[PDB]
């Protein structure tokens, strides 16, 4: 598994 920790960057399922 390697989901995002704090939406780090733009690879993460909690920016949008």
């Given at each position: 598994?390697?989901d995002?920790?704090?939406c780090?960057?733009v690879?993460?399922?909690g920016?949008?």
């Amino acid at each position: 598994n390697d989901d995002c920790e704090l939406c780090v960057n733009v690879a993460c399922t909690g920016c949008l």
